[PDB]
Structures are given as C-alpha cells and as structure tokens.
Amino acid sequence: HMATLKVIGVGGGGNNAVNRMIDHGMNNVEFIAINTAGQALNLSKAESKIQIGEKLTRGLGAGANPEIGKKAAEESREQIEDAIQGADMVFVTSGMGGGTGTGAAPVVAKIAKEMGALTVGVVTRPFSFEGRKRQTQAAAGVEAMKAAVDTLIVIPNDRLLDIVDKSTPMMEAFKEADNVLRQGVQGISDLIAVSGEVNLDFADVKTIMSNQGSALMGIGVSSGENRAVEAAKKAISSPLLETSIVGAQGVLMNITGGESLSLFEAQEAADIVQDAADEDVNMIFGTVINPELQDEIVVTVIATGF
Numbered sequence: 001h002m003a004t005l006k007v008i009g010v011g012g013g014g015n016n017a018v019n020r021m022i023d024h025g026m027n028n029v030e031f032i033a034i035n036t037a038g039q040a041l042n043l044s045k046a047e048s049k050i051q052i053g054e055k056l057t058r059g060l061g062a063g064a065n066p067e068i069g070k071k072a073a074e075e076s077r078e079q080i081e082d083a084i085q086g087a088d089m090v091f092v093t094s095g096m097g098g099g100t101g102t103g104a105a106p107v108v109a110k111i112a113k114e115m116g117a118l119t120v121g122v123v124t125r126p127f128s129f130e131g132r133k134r135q136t137q138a139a140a141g142v143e144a145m146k147a148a149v150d151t152l153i154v155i156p157n158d159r160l161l162d163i164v165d166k167s168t169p170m171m172e173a174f175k176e177a178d179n180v181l182r183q184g185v186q187g188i189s190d191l192i193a194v195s196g197e198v199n200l201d202f203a204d205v206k207t208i209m210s211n212q213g214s215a216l217m218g219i220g221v222s223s224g225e226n227r228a229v230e231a232a233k234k235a236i237s238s239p240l241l242e243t244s245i246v247g248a249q250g251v252l253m254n255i256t257g258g259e260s261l262s263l264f265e266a267q268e269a270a271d272i273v274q275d276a277a278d279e280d281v282n283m284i285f286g287t288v289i290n291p292e293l294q295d296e297i298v299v300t301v302i303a304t305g306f
C-alpha cells in the first residue's frame, strides 16, 4: 500500500533531465520518456518510452512549434494513459519555449490529473539570450501548465547564470537545475516510506499540493551548531526558483535527524519558515528520527498557497 511515483520527461530538456536523474540513481520511481524526436528517444535511459507525432514529424522534432507538440500528444493520449496507469503522483518535467515541451507537456499533465494523480510540473523558462519570441512561447506554455497541474515549479534558466563562475561546465549547471526535481522527488519518496515520530503520509502531500498553483520545493542539510536554522534557511532560499517562499500560505515541512533532534531546534527551523513566508502559514509538520544520522539534520520544505 505504498504510493507510486513517476517522472515524465517531455521533449528534449525533459528527456535530458530524466537521463541525468537515472544516471544519478533514483530508486522506487518509474521514469517515462515522451518525445517527437526518435533519435533522442532511442538514446533515452527510461524504462518506458513513448514516441508521439510520428505521422506528424516523421520522427524528427516539432522544430520549436508548440502546436505540433500539442497535436502529437493529444493523438497519443491512450499510450500516455497506459504509461501513467498505476501512478499516485506524477512529475512532468520539460523545458518551455520549444515545440514539444511547450505543447505536449500540458497535455501530459492534464492526462495525469484526470487519472487522479497528484500532478506536479517542474519546467524551465528559456535564457534571455534565446530571444523574446522563445520567452513568449515559454510563457504561454507556463500558463498552460498551470491550468493542467496541481502545482507548478518554474526554473528560469537565467538563474543558472547566477550560480556559475566563468568556467562552470554547462552540464554541471544543468545538474543544479535537475536537483530541484530530483531532491523534491526524493524528499517526498522518503517522507512516504519512513514512518516518522510526528508522522506525515502521502495524504498530507496531497493536502499541500492538490490544486494549488505555484509551488516551492526545497531541501537543506546541515550539521554543527545552529544546524536546524541553517538547514531550514537552505531549504527555502534556492537562487534558481521563480517562486520564492514569500507569501507562501501552505507549507509541508519535515525534519529528519538523529536521536539528538531537540524540540527547541525543531521550533527554530519552523519559525524560520513561518517568518520568511511573512504570512501566517498553514504548516503540516513532521519529524523523522533516523539514528544512522549523527549530527546531520535534513529539512524538507514544500510550499504552496501563493
């Protein structure tokens, strides 16, 4: 009776994200690759691959046309549905601005939502250097995604330019963007498998994420003195997110630590999130005592209600 989580990459960036997460190792999660491009799809490492629009595109891409991606997805609805079937939670990841992701990712999410799955989008917006038409297409896709998901995390690719130095490889920067989805999925998966002392379950995840719009999904790990405060600051202060914690009115917050986890520092962590939100936050709070940890503390935050 464990919740089934799947991650679906749509289009090239989404396919890239899936491949990098599989390489990094992700257990108990099923991956699905959806694309118009057959070359990319044949190099995908996902167990489940769906080629959409083969008649439309002959296995090439949609060439940055969103209408092609939308039509390709709608005409493969049943295959997408079969691939999703059994899922309790679906993450759809895609780079907005192109044709396949922009057009197909909202269809995929709507399919998941109408199968009852808790449906979370994690998408990118294009770099400014890609031009205003691409940004405008991406914007339309972001809006379409919001209509189709339960919660949406947007990562403006421009924020990657804030976290590199002059030498950081592009693949390394892309992995920092991948960590938003990967660590969010892993945090939800760990919350679900492990009974905590103050317990949170999938139903608590649905309460914070179902039908909520923009969201924030963060993780923080710290040790030493003031660890709980520092871990909580880390969980809510990502430089890559379009939606910051501010104005968040619902929050799911789980703290994992060793047997040394004090009530005092749990309150400290929670106050850091309440204060940073600058609202009265509806907090769903959990704790998990993992004795294998020694002096390490993990704070997972999901915030919605914007």
Ligand SMILES: Nc1nc2c(ncn2[C@@H]2O[C@H](COP(=O)(O)OP(=O)(O)O)[C@@H](O)[C@H]2O)c(=O)[nH]1
Pocket (backbone or CB within 6 Å): 010, 011, 012, 013, 014, 016, 017, 061, 062, 063, 064, 094, 095, 096, 097, 098, 099, 100, 101, 102, 124, 125, 126, 127, 130, 134, 157, 174, 177
């Ligand atoms: N962060 C990140 N952004 C990507 C990646 N690949 C593509 N992008 C971005 O996603 C947008 C759409 O590209 P792509 O996914 O290849 O288009 P599609 O396959 O035609 O939907 C691009 O304009 C880039 O902004 C990636 O691997 N990581």
Ligand SMILES: [K+]
Pocket (backbone or CB within 6 Å): 191, 192, 193, 194, 195, 196, 199, 200, 201
């Ligand atoms: K649990």
